[PDB]
Amino acid sequence: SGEYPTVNEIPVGEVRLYQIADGVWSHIATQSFDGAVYPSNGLIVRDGDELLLIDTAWGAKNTAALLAEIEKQIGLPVTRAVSTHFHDDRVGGVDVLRAAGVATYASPSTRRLAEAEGNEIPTHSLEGLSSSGDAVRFGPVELFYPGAAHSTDNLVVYVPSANVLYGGCAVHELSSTSAGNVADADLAEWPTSVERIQKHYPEAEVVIPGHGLPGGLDLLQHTANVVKAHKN
Ligand SMILES: CCOc1ncccc1-c1c(C(=O)O)[nH]c2c(C(C)C)cccc12
Ligand SMILES: [Zn+2]
Numbered sequence: 205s206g207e208y209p210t211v212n213e214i215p216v217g218e219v220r221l222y223q224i225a226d227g228v229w230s231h232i233a234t235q236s237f238d239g240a241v242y243p244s245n246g247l248i249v250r251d252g253d254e255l256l257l258i259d260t261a262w263g264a265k266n267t268a269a270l271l272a273e274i275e276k277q278i279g280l281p282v283t284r285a286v287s288t289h290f291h292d293d294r295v296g297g298v299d300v301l302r303a304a305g306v307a308t309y310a311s312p313s314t315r316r317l318a319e320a321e322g323n324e325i326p327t328h329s330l331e332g333l334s335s336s337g338d339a340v341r342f343g344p345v346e347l348f349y350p351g352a353a354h355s356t357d358n359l360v361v362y363v364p365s366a367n368v369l370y371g372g373c374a375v376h377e378l379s380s381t382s383a384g385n386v387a388d389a390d391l392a393e394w395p396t397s398v399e400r401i402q403k404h405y406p407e408a409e410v411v412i413p414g415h416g417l418p419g420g421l422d423l424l425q426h427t428a429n430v431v432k433a434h435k436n
């Protein structure tokens with residue numbers, strides 16, 4: 205009923221959308237992993253009379269449910285998707301997307317890692333993102349590679365028309381007390397990569413983490429603080 209969705213308010217097997225700004229939504233779904241249940245976020249950005257999707261809904265059935273929710277709530281076709289790193293909360297569902305007519309994209313680094321992991325693999329490679337600080341345009345967004353953080357391949361996404369920064373899993377929500385799933389992380393570089401984001405996007409108004417509640421620019425500093433304390 206208008207608050208940001210959580211596991212407790214998403215019916216089983218479902219997806220919810222949340223309007224962030226004009227022509228910008230997040231998508232929220234839940235998944236089980238290793239016997240625990242987690243929420244995750246992605247992004248939807250209006251691209252004229254089409255939509256750009258950022259990240260899957262963490263699984264094939266969740267991603268089918270995401271497409272249905274988009275049809276119900278927005279009614280414009282999803283024509284392209286970008287996955288922001290190789291984990292299953294970002295690429296799990298890419299095969300569903302690909303069979304629904306969506307063109308799927310990721311950096312070459314993400315594609316290699318996904319393949320090596322046994323995860324679903326986006327079709328198209330995003331060049332121009334291999335060095336930290338690199339940025340490229342993709343429809344209505346900018347894609348930015350901040351350096352290694354949550355993963356070596358993590359990308360962030362900026363929506364310039366709305367000053368929305370989608371941090372993905374490199375950015376944590378303000379209630380977080382730990383650095384989340386750090387299996388593939390670079391704890392030592394992560395603060396430096398966050399500082400690069402802070403420097404590049406000083407006008408961000410909304411910051412969306414890969415998991416949990418959006419907020420403002422303070423999510424960036426909080427993330428650096430939690431990572432440094434996990435490493436300590
Ligand atoms: C282990 C604790 O993990 C987290 N705890 C809090 C929030 C997020 C996670 C988490 C993340 C992340 O931090 O991005 N990725 C996950 C995966 C990925 C690898 C699919 C699976 C399970 C959990 C997670
Ligand atoms: Zn991840």
Ligand SMILES: [Zn+2]
Nearest residue numbers: 293373414415
């Ligand atoms: Zn994640």
